[PDB]
């Protein structure tokens, strides 16, 4: 899935818009009716750590 989301940049007052590819398995929508808005699979459990 070609995702697009907002993200805070190095400037604390500014942000940045990026895009990245994520698998469907690590993608969970907020609800099953809206569509096109999703979240990470592990967001309501804990915050992952990038290796």
């Amino acid at each position: 899935k070609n995702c697009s989301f907002n993200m805070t940049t190095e400037l604390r007052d500014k942000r940045q818009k990026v895009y990245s590819l994520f698998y469907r398995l690590d993608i969970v929508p907020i609800n099953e009716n809206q569509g096109s808005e999703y979240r990470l699979i592990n967001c309501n459990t804990s915050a992952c750590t990038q290796a």
Epitope: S4, N6, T9, L11, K14, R15, Q16, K17
Partner: antibody, heavy 132, light 106 residues
Framework: EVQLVESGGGLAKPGGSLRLSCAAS????????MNWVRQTPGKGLEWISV????????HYADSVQGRFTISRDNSKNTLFLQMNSLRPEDTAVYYC?????????????????????????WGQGVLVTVSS | QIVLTQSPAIMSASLGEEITLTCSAT?????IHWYQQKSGTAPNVLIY???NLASGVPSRFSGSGSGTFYSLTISSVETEDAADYYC?????????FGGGTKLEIK
């Protein structure tokens, strides 16, 4: 290639209302801004409004603030500009253009802010005016 | 607010004659984009970011500048070059264009 056409412009009533239109294809219209400029007969080019991606803001010019409004439909990839209380001095050859690159990058408030924008692709010259 | 101004307003050049177009502003900007338009057509872009030329445009067009002074240099002038040019700014509001410069074959 990038193919874009515009329609809806033409004769109208002085001080009444009219709604322009512009269609785009060949690219991700939801990730690119849209600008509306005007070229009066025999003079230079004039910019009047700009619409941001996702319908964030609608920064206008001082001569058209409160009179005209720009809206977009990313679902249908159609850009329509609403004209209200247009006067005969507002006659010009309006153009529908697209910015240089997409909004993906650093920004302050609206997603496409702080990015080198130059009109690279334009449409057909439509004439908008009012008469009897 | 920033206001742009071009000079000269009207110029006449012959075939193969060296000319120079300039654009100025009341405040410093990051870059100035040059354009050209013909009656009834769509304005095309030629030089962006003040140094990089557009794709497919002839190499006769050139330009440079910094601060509040910018210029457009046409090494060779042909019959098709007779048109109206402009300069556009993007740094601050209101994203206005230049004063416009008409070119005619001498």
């Amino acid at each position: 290639e990038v193919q874009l056409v515009e329609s809806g412009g033409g004769l109208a009533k002085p001080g009444g209302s009219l709604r322009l239109s512009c269609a785009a294809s060949g690219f991700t219209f939801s990730d690119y801004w849209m600008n509306w400029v005007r070229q009066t007969p025999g003079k230079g080019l004039e910019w009047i409004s700009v619409i941001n991606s996702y319908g964030g803001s609608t920064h206008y010019a001082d001569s058209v603030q409160g009179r005209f409004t720009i809206s977009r439909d990313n679902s249908k990839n159609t850009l329509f500009l609403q004209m209200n209380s247009l006067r005969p001095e507002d006659t010009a050859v309006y153009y529908c253009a697209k910015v240089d690159a997409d909004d993906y990058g650093y920004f302050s408030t609206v997603p496409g802010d702080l990015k080198n924008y130059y009109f690279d692709y334009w449409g057909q010259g439509v004439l908008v005016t009012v008469s009897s | 607010q920033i206001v742009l101004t071009q000079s000269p307003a009207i110029m006449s050049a012959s075939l193969g004659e060296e000319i120079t177009l300039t654009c100025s502003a009341t405040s410093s900007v990051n870059s100035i984009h040059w354009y050209q338009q013909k009656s009834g057509t769509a304005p095309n872009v030629l030089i962006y970011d003040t140094s990089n030329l557009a794709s497919g445009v002839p190499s006769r067009f050139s330009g440079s500048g910094s601060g509040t002074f910018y210029s457009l240099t046409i090494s060779s002038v042909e019959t098709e070059d007779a048109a109206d040019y402009y300069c556009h700014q993007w740094t601050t509001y209101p994203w206005t264009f230049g004063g416009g410069t008409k070119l005619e074959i001498k």
